[PDB]
Design a protein around this ligand. Structure first.
Ligand SMILES: *[C@@H]1CCOC(=O)c2c(O)cc(O)cc2OC[C@@H](O)[C@H](O)[C@H](O)C(=O)C1
Length: 341
């Protein structure tokens, strides 16, 4: 058993010569050599079984990724675990080895407009597949976008994903915490549980802005502060958009604010392509019902060099629609059985 930074990695004998990469949800990510396929791979160690929410995140991801097959979604090549439930303490998920993630890339690298266009195209192409499966990713952010050496992009981490449920999306003011804060749509803080596809388009718009400037566009320092940053750039919502918000507490909070003017995108991003800024505006639209959808975004003039609906596939088998951790562990054991001897 090889150890990496005081952490056992029981992945032998198939996977050897381990190297640290970073941290996932319930454990670390390493690279390793695959002695069967004679290539290096990435391996994520997960230790979720003490906690019901961890088991939930682990089961969601495994169930989804084993059904999905798409060029812009990183797949599961192998799952390593003990042969019995009694002996199962950790799970190792083996995936293609990528070169970097967009979070690390944006810390030091300026993106050319050609790279921004290609990265955005690939994010939306993968997102089209996800949404066609009636699935919401719900945690899109640069660290969940992986790049290989030729800048092919893959979406990672479905542990926060859910099946879309727009009829049950409404909730009260200041109750929801969906997504990582900086990528969270304004309606999460106002009246939404994050159960509609527009949640993901907002996150993509935040990622686009960050690719244009190498800094987060809405860097809220805490929960309600996130809405301060959003409104500081978008300006005050229109009467029509407020009439959309029937919840009285959320609407009255917005009405209590002083009038704020919109900051023009081309003042925030003076070197950006004007077509990129037009698409950015449509993704970062306050009203989630008016916000552009993934297939419309793919057809936007900014992406005309890449757009090809017949090469933008959808899912064959969409997902249609309280468990103690003991039952979740059994479910995880069952879902991973296909990779055993
Ligand atoms: C993604 C989990 C899989 O991540 C990877 O496979 C991965 C590869 O292949 C290369 C590099 O450089 C990073 C990387 O993941 C880094 C993770 O920390 C990632 O950002 C994210 O946190 C995650 O776990 C989901």
């Amino acid at each position: 058993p090889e150890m990496v930074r005081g952490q056992v990695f029981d992945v032998g004998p198939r996977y050897t010569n381990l190297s640290y990469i970073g941290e996932g949800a319930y454990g670390m990510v390493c690279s390793a050599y695959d002695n069967l396929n004679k290539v290096r791979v990435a391996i994520k160690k997960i230790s979720p079984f003490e906690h019901q929410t961890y088991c939930q995140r682990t089961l969601r991801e495994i169930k989804i990724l084993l059904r999905f097959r798409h060029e812009n979604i990183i797949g599961i090549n192998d799952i390593i675990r003990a042969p019995t439930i009694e002996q199962m303490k950790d799970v190792y998920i083996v995936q293609d080895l990528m070169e970097t993630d967009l979070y690390k890339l944006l810390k030091t690298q300026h993106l050319s407009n050609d790279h921004i266009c290609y990265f955005l195209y690939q994010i939306l192409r993968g997102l089209k597949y996800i949404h066609s499966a009636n699935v919401l990713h719900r945690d899109l952010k640069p660290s969940n976008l992986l790049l290989n050496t030729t800048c092919d992009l893959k979406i990672c981490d479905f542990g926060l994903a859910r099946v879309a449920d727009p009829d049950h999306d409404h909730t009260g003011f200041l109750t929801e915490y969906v997504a990582t804060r900086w990528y969270r749509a304004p309606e999460i803080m106002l009246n939404s549980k994050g159960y509609t596809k527009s949640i993901d388009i907002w996150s993509v718009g935040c990622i686009l802005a960050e690719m244009l400037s190498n800094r987060p566009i809405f860097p809220g320092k805490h929960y309600l502060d996130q809405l301060n940053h959003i409104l500081g750039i978008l300006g005050s919502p229109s009467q029509e958009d407020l009439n959309c918000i029937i919840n009285l507490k959320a609407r009255n909070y917005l009405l209590s604010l002083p009038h704020k003017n919109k900051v023009p995108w081309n003042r925030l991003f003076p070197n950006a392509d004007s077509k990129a800024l037009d698409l950015l505006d449509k993704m970062l639209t306050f009203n989630p019902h008016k916000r552009i959808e993934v297939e419309q975004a793919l057809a936007h003039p900014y992406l005309e060099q890449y757009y090809d609906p017949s090469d933008e596939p959808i899912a064959e088998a969409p997902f249609k629609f309280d468990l103690p951790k003991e039952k979740l562990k059994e479910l995880i054991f069952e879902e991973t059985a296909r990779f055993q001897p």
